């Protein structure tokens, strides 16, 4: 088992995740099995506490784990399926060790950070690196990405663990890549290597020695800066890799392959890649990165979102839209519309922003209501679903656009003008959405539907069955708690709201599709968790093909 | 509230505990209320897992907590009663924070070491420093002793916490004392200040600045070494305190008062001691420290102990014996006798060590069987209790010498030759000791008798009632699980084994005293937890007064 | 004597010189006597070895010292006269100590870096801080600017010296200001305080504690960044000073006075400024900084310079031009014309750049030939002087434009077509410029005319006498070696080349002024060494007033 550790230098927002993912993509293209581990030095255990407006985009693995979005980035770039243990945190390690000590399996000894916490870290890393992530074959390389910057208090147990680890796994199996900031004060316009010198000094002091240096700057750095860095950091000048700000993120593995990273890793980790097939063709990645700078025709999509700030709060959604638009060969223009600026309460307060938001929503080609874990701004979501329903505008709803869609449908098409949720307003005669928790053996009470579940379609006349390649079932990822009530599902089925897919027991409803409309569908699950750069997801594919009037042509 | 933080320098075994305790003793003598906090950077939560041969001498507070022996040292030197929270560890802090995060009282934020763990440490320290330890009056100074050496990974959260803390409590209320090693290579016989320079550099880097430097050497250091240290560490030359190896530990507060520490603390922390009464007489401490170097007549006591190694494995016991001997005005010579080297199995293996151990046990004036948390070597304890019973040699048993004494009494005086425990050999018709756990409301099951409990004596003719000042009750500290069976307690009461004291409900037995013997008593509790330098404990007092034939004279 | 030390943080080009000069300007305006010391950690002793294309603009003090240009910046901003010892370097200190040791005035002891080099540094600093720089009154504050970044090997003796020094001069007389880089990666657009945290940690470790933090960013930083910095660096949030990129350098003292630096220094150094007169009016500095952003009408000046690169290679010249243009109330547009691109050798090689350079020289309003210490490109200087002479374009020559002007005058007006220098081509019958070195008692041989010398004018009809306020003499600064030959000075005086000023002995010639021309003058000295922001120098004043046809109007 070979390891590649990716550490960070001067500051935090220095670009470690894209470097690690690109390493993975290169090695994958060369024919290797690659897993990856992300280490977060914060005290949390999961993302089930994280507020959406505070961190954004809980990513859900197919075993039901709510983890960092960085594991989502690895899943997209490497095309693998990671588990909950592929994400180590400080809280997880300290909890495992404190519990082990409290049930007396250290045999009365004093448990200390060194060596017990570092032994725990090393055993965890060695353990989850042999777990298969692509089928059943063992991985051959593991990319470990360490969060934070060297010198911080929070990351010291981990660098101590990895010093000992580099000697435990026989250094010919261990490579370290250091990502640092080469700043450039515009008072003189010269790249400064002094912060990199300091950070590599701290790294050497802690016991680790870099094999690659990845510099982060805005344009390329010359050979003099490269030679100064290789002199102070003890690498070769070819092992100093410059990654400037490129067009897209899909150009970073190509820029890494242009700097000859594959040959250095093939000799340093003693892999035995046969460097003959075009040097392990990254051919379709080249096609995709070329399309990213070629598309011209625009498609405008609206995103009715509560936390309009985009500190990665709709990351998987935006990326599913991008992967869909690139395969449709069109440029994506994304509009973010606050959902609370759509209710006429703002009209009562000040009509200016109300009107401009409504005009931005009106001049769009398609609508996407994402799933906010909450009820704040749901009124705007109902208004937007209604507007799109009575204007023949294509719409896709995600885990809450289903609830909002069925609510507005009942309200303004079946006369149940008091239909609402039990999310809020739990005092309602017409509870259109109810709470049907999961009851699996091993539960006392009930919890969400979490993870990969099977879904079976109903009948013939539906487009979602076509976009999915006409299969009988489809496995997707669920993170919901509330459903719709079957009384009403057969009430509002005579009126135009067909239910196309649901579980094997037919007790819940997952995909609605109101007929007599170009594209009006909704899903309880999240389709943006299985969207990859080289294979988009069929719901977003259809939403893009409909918003530019290419859907029917694509069906045939 | 004023604080004094005591940190450590070059190595670990540098003498921090005695420095902190002596600070406390000085300030106490000057008329102040002093509490103290001990910080252990290890991952454990309590000492209930610690093996006795691994750390030695679990100390039991009077609320039932099993803590470090350093809290025992503070209790002896300061004459206070500390609680479980006066002993912070890394495990306690990380467990409190992980639990707070897992029940969502950080409100969805990311919990990080800085600032959340350091905020937790600061709030804990501020909290337990206002808890009264002497009656009900609030403390005025708090001595915080930080374990480990500056620069270690385990102690970084704590020094970060205390940097922020020094600014939160208004520096005129915060003083730091740094204890360092001044080594002396005998190749040249000159004290070296260079390691102190390095450690104070690391301390300054982490954000703290010393107010006192306490050097640790074998003989005094001159004024040139003192001036070099004050030059590199930014203190005055009078704030460099030399503590060499003295006669006893009772000379350290006197040596601190000779270096004018009280005046510096009175001006630096702005206490308002009225330095007139002999400068706050340490008079009876002077008497005790003088007696330590004056006593001449010897008394030899045997300690039948399993783990003959004395890495502080019988600390409170040995110190109770010392406090008893000093008030009796005699020198104490302590013999450690392995309990497993008394059973004739070693006689079968090799009789040499068997015979020499038995001769050491035979030429002693008194026997003390301590309480080992286990059953290893109990056979030797039975043999020793029997030998002392049939030779009129004074004996005191502690929490297991009671069980061993009653076992040998039954065996070799009432014919129940198969009497044993349920500790080991749970298959016995004659279970002399049984398991009567505590059942207090708030329990599901049963746990030990732990902490301070009341004890009432039975009748008139007993010496233990006399040594205790003839009170009706006495509060002591229990850490036992097994008792004796009442059937047998009234069986072997006609034969000479009187039961003098027990609980209020008379369902257990605590003090046995077999009459027709100079001094043969036993106790279920531990009397060595309430033994102080200036007031010994009556059981050990009587054991010393009997082993030198001064008991009857002392009674009158 | 009060001290202010200015140190540097993360990188080198962080802006220390302007911060130190602005401190000086503020304190000067408040009515204090201020001196300043610059510490360069390089091994050189003077700038007499520095190549002009390598460092640029040797500045000449009025005692004959060739020093850094930073002393020129202090002289301009503070309006003082510094000496050679106001510029400490590593070479100076180590040479003084090595020589002291080699002549046995350490009395046989071992001389070590600590304490002997640091004692030398401290005595030097204490010594030159009491030397008067403005008349004869003792200074009251001293600004010490330490070059380089904390953590470098070259600057460790100096920070050790200043730790000891802060305690030697009684901390109430010592203040430290730390200038650091707050970088801003545009991937997220958030200012990062982590490098400042690291550098202040190193600074604290070395023994110094900041009193002010001066952050360097492109736009202002908020109160959250300010609070994070004050938390980690132990200052108040008002002592965190943000200096963004402003219009000019004359806005930095005003931005410092807006952040209340004067009040903090008045309380911290216990100066006794009476903060009543507008809080010590920086009134004419306000006028000048306002004019910097108000001037509209343009004036274009050409600079025929060898090393067209401007790494501060014509700093004093460009600044004299700016100070002149601002008082004339016009905007200055400066053109840099390579002197070697004017000889027709480039015409033979490629005429494109030749022609474009000649067109840039042709479309200018005035010409300035600066003094290059050499002979490279002098041919272009002769061509430019000739072009300006036969086109009635105003010209000013500086220490080599005098030689070039007299050479072209002889050549193309008196028929001596082989007139040249002994600088190059030492084989010439018509040596128009000769070498007349200085012979002062205390010399074996000859050296340059270096430092402040007196100059007496000749007669009535001249404009340079008018621009100087019609004085009899003027003290200027000389750094030349070659002069003109008196035979020829009376040869080409009938032809239109009048000599207006020279020494007291009339053996050399300093100011030529060819009549029958708007403004054609030349000077052997450098007038750009006495040019101040609030009083320009008369030669450049006249050159600007002539290039915009305002000279004659200004004369009356
Ligand atoms: N394979 C990846 C990796 C990165 N990202 C996105 O690109 C942005 C920048 O990535 P990253 O390198 O992780 O930036 P930072 O997290 O700010 O830098 P660091 O990890 O060093 O803290 C992130 O929002 C991430 O969602 C992505 O699209 N796909
Ligand atoms: N470990 C080091 C490295 C360099 N220097 C000093 O730093 C100075 C160079 O300044 P700087 O430009 O900041 O260093 P660079 O190596 O050039 O780094 P940068 O890329 O930021 O320019 C030199 O005088 C050198 O003596 C030092 O003292 N200690
Ligand atoms: N008030 C005190 C403090 C110390 N001791 C005893 O003296 C010995 C040495 O004390 P200490 O200073 O704590 O030594 P170390 O623990 O080895 O040093 P450190 O705390 O720095 O690790 C210990 O066994 C302790 O039991 C004591 O009798 N009474
Ligand atoms: N921060 C310091 C302190 C001292 N020195 C050097 O260390 C040498 C002194 O050696 P040493 O005896 O080890 O230092 P001392 O201060 O005397 O420490 P010690 O008490 O161990 O003798 C001197 O040459 C001095 O230049 C140094 O380089 N850096
Ligand atoms: N009072 C001053 C100070 C600075 N300068 C000029 O402004 C430029 C930047 O000044 P400085 O702060 O010294 O920049 P650096 O030298 O690059 O930064 P540092 O001193 O920290 O190395 C320099 O070219 C200098 O000539 C100026 O005009 N007048
Ligand atoms: N001395 C310190 C300071 C901070 N942290 C950790 O650093 C993380 C914060 O990351 P970063 O953003 O890089 O630190 P900031 O203080 O916010 O610095 P910056 O201004 O660059 O954002 C937190 O988890 C905190 O636990 C640490 O380990 N050691
Ligand atoms: Mg990242
Ligand atoms: Mg440099
Ligand atoms: Mg100790
Ligand atoms: Mg020495
Ligand atoms: Mg500078
Ligand atoms: Mg941050």
Numbering used by the authors:
A (entry chain A), B (entry chain C), C (entry chain B): 1 to 556
Give the original sentences from the paper that presented this experimental model.
For the product-bound state (dmCTPS+Pro), we imaged dmCTPS in the presence of 10 mM Mg2+ and 2 mM CTP and picked 1,563,553 particles. In contrast, the dmCTPS+Pro model represents an inhibited state of dmCTPS. In this conformation, the UTP binding site is occupied by CTP as a well-known competitive inhibitor. To our surprise, we identified a second CTP molecule in an individual subunit of the dmCTPS+Pro tetramer, whose binding site overlaps with ATP/ADP. Since CTP is the only nucleotide present under the conditions of analysis, it is unlikely that another molecule could be mistaken for CTP in our map. In addition, the electron density agrees very well with the CTP structure, confirming our findings of the CTP binding site of CTPS and also raising the possibility that binding competition, which inhibits the activity of CTPS, may occur at both the UTP and ATP binding sites. However, the unexpected finding of a CTP molecule siting at the ATP/ADP binding site of the map gives rise to the notion that CTP may block CTPS by competing with UTP and also with ATP, suggesting an added level of complexity of feedback inhibition. The wing is also flexible in our dmCTPS+Pro model. In the dmCTPS+Pro tetramer, the length is around 23.5 Å, and the diameter ranges from 3.38 to 5.54 Å. We analyzed the conformational change at the UTP binding site and determined that the distance from CTP to the exit of the tunnel is about 18.8 Å in the dmCTPS+Pro, whereas UTP in dmCTPS+Sub sits right before the opening at a distance of about 5.4 Å.
Cytidine triphosphate synthase (CTPS) catalyzes the final and rate-limiting step of de novo CTP biosynthesis, in which a UTP is converted into CTP with the consumption of an ATP and a glutamine. A CTPS protein comprises two domains, the N-terminal ammonia ligase (AL) domain and the C-terminal glutamine amidotransferase (GAT) domain. While the active site at the AL domain activates UTP by phosphorylation using ATP to generate an iminophosphate intermediate that can react with ammonia to yield CTP, the GAT domain mediates the hydrolysis of glutamine to yield NH3 with GTP as allosteric activator. The nascent ammonia is delivered through an “ammonia tunnel,” which connects the active sites at both domains, to complete the reaction.
